[PDB]
Symmetry: C3
C-alpha cells in the first residue's frame, strides 16, 4: 500500500508565525527516509505553494478568510487526487485550519469516512462564536453537516461542502473548550473523551470505546487529524496553543499503535508543529522527534519491535 | 449557593517560613475574580490577623503550641460563623495545622460531616509520636475522637473537641508515613488510598470507592482538606514537604471534578502553598496556577467545558 | 531471612564508560545502611575485583568477549555460593551483561527459578544479530535453552550452560526492540508487556498476569533483573541507553511492591546506573535515589507505611 505525503506550509490560520516551517522541521529530522524503512511505499509529494490573496480584509471577526480558504481549496484538490489513486495521505502541517482541505479532499473519494481528532481543543468555533478571528480554531465548523447555515458564508469557503456528520467524529485529549464550543458539542451530541475521560477509563479502554462507536456497525476509512498540542507540553512544547495536563508521549503512541492495527487508516494530519516557538533547540528537537514517532507508529513501528517477514535472523 | 473565602496567613505550624504568603499568592493570581465567573456567589472575607502569643515555650517536643492553638481557635470561630449562614468556606492556607480550626469550625454547624484528606502525609502524629515538634503534621490527632486522651493536653488546645471519628475520614495520596502514624491508621482502621492504591485501581475507581465508603449510607456534607504536597512536586514544587511519586495534575483535578459532582462539598482547604520555596519564579507560577485550578474545579469548571444556562450561543 | 549485596563494577559489556561507578554511587547514597533499617539481615559482600583479560580480541562482531565472560564466571561463582547459604543476592551493577553471571549462579542453587526482566530492551541479541558487538544487549541469548547452538561459541562462555527456558521469563517495559530481537521473542513465544501492554492494561493488571503466568502452577524462586533504563529517562536519566515513554517512578515501585508481597524474591539486579552520564549532579541524584527506592521496596518498604511488629506506639 501507498504513502503519499503532502506538505502544507500554512500559517494564516492563526497569529503566531513559525508553523509553516513545520513541514521542513519534520523532513529535516528525516521523516520520509524513516518512513521508507517501513513495509510501506513512500512517495514525497513536496511542499505546496500557497498563493497569497492580496488585501485579504477580515470578514467581521475572522482573519485571513480569503487566504485560508484558497489554500485549503488547493489542498483538498491534491489530497482528493492521491486518494483517487488509492494511496494514504499524510499531510505535514502548519496550523490546524488545513484540516478543512485535508479532510474535504478525503471525503470526496471516501464519503463514508470517519474522523479521530486528537487535539486539546475541539476547534469547532463558528465565525459567530470565536473571540478571535482565528481559523485554525474552527476547522470542524466548516466540515460539520449539522452546522450548515448556522453562520454566514465566509469569503473563499464557498467551495466547502459539509462532508461529515456529528455521528462520524470522535475527540480525544480535550482540555480547553470555550463556552460556545462546549455548547455545540453538547447540543449536537458529539462523542468525545476529554482528559477527564482518559483519566477515568485509561487510554486502553478509550480506544476500545471509540473503535466500537465509529466502527461498530460499518468498517470505514479512518482519517486521523492529530495535532501536536494534544499531548502535554512536556512532550510537545514547540506549539502555539499548549495546554497543561495532556496526553502522555505513551498514550500518544498507544493511540497511533491501535489505529495502525485497524488497517483502516486512510488519511493523517501531523499539525501545529511550530519550530520557532521552542524555548531551547532541545524543546524543538523533542517536539519534532515525537511528531515523527507518532507518524511512524501509524504505519507499523511497534514499541515491542519489528522484524521483516520471511527473514530467518538465525 | 454562597462561597466565603477565608485567608489564614499562618506559618508557626512548621519551621520553613513563607507559607503565610500563600493567601496573597493565590489572590495575586486572581483566584477570587476567577471564582466569581462561576455560577456561584463569592464574598471574600479577607485575611485573618493572628495574634502572636509571647514567650510561646515548647510543650515537651511540640513547638509554638500556644500560638497555633490560638490561631485555630480564631479560625474555627469564623468558619463556624459563615457555615452558620449556609455558605461554603474556602480556607486559603498557610501550613496544614490550620486544618484543626478549619474543620473544628465546620463540625459545629455540620457534625455529621466527612473528610477527604488529599496530602502525601497522614498528619496524624500525637505530640508523643512526632520526631519534630511540628503541628502541621498532627492536625488529625487533635480531631480524631478515638485519639482522645492518648496524649497530654497541649497548651492552647483546650477548646478543641474531637469532632470526627475514624469512620468519617478518607486519605488520598499518601506516600510518606512515619512508623507511629502507620501504626495508628492501621490500629484505628482508617480508610486510605496510598499511592500504591491509586496505581493499582486508577484514580477513577478510587473516587468510586471513597464516595461509597463515606457516602454509601447517609449523604452528608463533604470537607475537602487539600494540600498542595499531595501532587507530585513536578506540579506543586513550591511546598515545604515535597515527596516524589505523587498524584498527577490530571488526577488532582479528577478528584476535584468528582467532588463537585456530589453537590455535597461544604468545606475546602487549599493549604501549604509556599511562594518563597520556589527555585524559579516559574515553579511558583506553576504551583499557584494549579492550586487555583483545583479550587475552580471544586466549584464547576470542567475540563470538557462550560456554557451558561439558557444562553443560545447560535 | 538474609541479604547479601554484591558489587559488580563492570563496564566492558558496552562502549560508554562510567557504569562501573554505579556500585559506589549506590553505596555513596547509603543503600546498605538503609537496607539494614528493614526487617532483614544485611551483609555487604563488597565489590568484586574483575581480572582484565589481555589482548581481548573481538570475536567477529562481539567486543571484549573474553573479559566479559571471565567476570560473569566469577560472579556466577559468588552468587551461587551465597545462594547456597540460603541468602538473597542483590547484585549492584554496572552494565546488564552481568545478568549472565547473576542468573547463572542463581540457577545453580534454584534451577526451577523464574525471571522478571524490567528493561526497555529485550537484550536478546545472539552474536549473529547484534549490529554492535555489545554484550550487555545479549545476556538473555546466553541463558535461553531454546537458543542453544543458534550461534557460535563465544570465547569464555564455554562455562555458560543455558539455565532457563522461554517459559520461565517475562519482560516488562519493552519499548526499543530491533528486528532480530523481535523475531526471536515472537518465534520462541516469550511472554512480555511492552509499554503498549502497560498502557492498555495498567501496571496493576500487568502484575496480576505475570504472577499467574510464571507462578500460576508451581511457586518458584523469583529473580528480578532490573535495569534502570526501564523507567522513563525523566526518572532514570543517568543511563547509557535511555528511551522515552517508559515506566513511571510510580509503576516502577508498584512492580517492586508486588514482588515483595510474593515473598518469593530470591535474586535481584540493580543494573546500568551510570553516574558520569548525568547532565547535572541532580540527574545523578535523581537516578540513584530512585534506584535505592526500588531496592528498598523489594524488601518491605511500602508507600503506605511501615511500623515495627510488637511495638505499641501509643
Ligand atoms: Mn487544533
Ligand atoms: Mn498535610
Ligand atoms: Mn538491559
Amino acid at each position: 500500500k501507498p504513502i503519499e505525503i503532502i506538505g502544507a506550509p500554512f500559517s494564516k490560520g492563526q497569529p503566531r508565525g513559525g508553523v509553516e516551517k513545520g513541514p521542513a522541521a519534520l523532513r529535516k529530522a528525516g521523516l520520509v527516509e524513516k518512513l521508507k524503512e517501513t513495509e510501506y511505499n513512500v512517495r514525497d509529494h513536496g511542499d505546496l505553494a500557497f498563493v497569497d490573496v492580496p488585501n485579504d480584509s477580515p470578514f467581521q471577526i475572522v482573519k485571513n478568510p480569503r487566504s485560508v480558504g484558497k489554500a485549503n481549496e488547493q489542498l483538498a484538490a491534491v489530497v482528493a487526487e492521491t486518494q483517487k489513486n488509492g494511496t494514504i495521505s499524510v499531510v505535514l502541517g502548519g496550523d490546524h485550519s488545513m484540516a478543512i482541505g485535508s479532510i474535504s479532499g478525503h471525503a470526496r473519494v471516501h464519503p463514508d469516512l470517519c474522523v479521530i481528532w486528537v487535539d486539546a481543543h475541539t476547534d469547532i468555533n463558528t465565525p459567530l462564536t470565536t473571540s478571535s478571528g482565528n481559523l485554525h480554531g474552527q476547522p470542524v465548523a466548516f466540515l460539520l453537516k449539522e452546522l450548515k447555515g448556522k453562520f454566514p458564508d465566509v469569503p473563499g469557503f464557498s467551495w466547502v461542502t459539509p462532508c461529515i456528520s456529528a455521528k462520524d467524529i470522535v475527540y480525544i485529549g480535550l482540555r480547553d473548550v470555550d463556552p460556545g464550543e462546549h455548547y455545540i458539542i453538547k447540543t449536537l451530541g458529539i462523542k468525545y473523551f476529554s482528559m477527564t475521560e482518559v483519566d477515568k477509563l485509561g487510554i486502553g479502554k478509550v480506544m476500545e470505546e471509540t473503535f466500537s462507536y465509529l466502527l461498530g456497525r460499518k468498517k470505514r476509512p479512518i482519517h486521523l487529524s492529530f495535532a501536536v498540542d494534544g499531548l502535554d507540553p512536556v512532550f510537545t512544547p514547540a506549539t502555539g496553543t499548549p495546554v497543561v495536563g495532556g496526553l502522555s508521549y505513551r498514550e500518544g503512541l498507544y493511540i497511533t499503535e491501535e489505529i495502525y492495527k485497524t488497517g483502516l487508516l486512510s488519511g493523517l494530519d501531523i499539525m501545529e508543529v511550530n519550530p520557532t516557538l521552542g524555548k531551547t533547540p532541545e524543546e524543538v528537537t523533542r517536539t519534532v522527534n515525537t511528531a515523527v514517532a507518532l507518524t511512524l507508529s501509524c504505519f507499523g513501528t511497534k514499541r515491542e519491535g519489528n522484524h521483516k517477514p520471511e527473514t530467518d535472523y538465525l
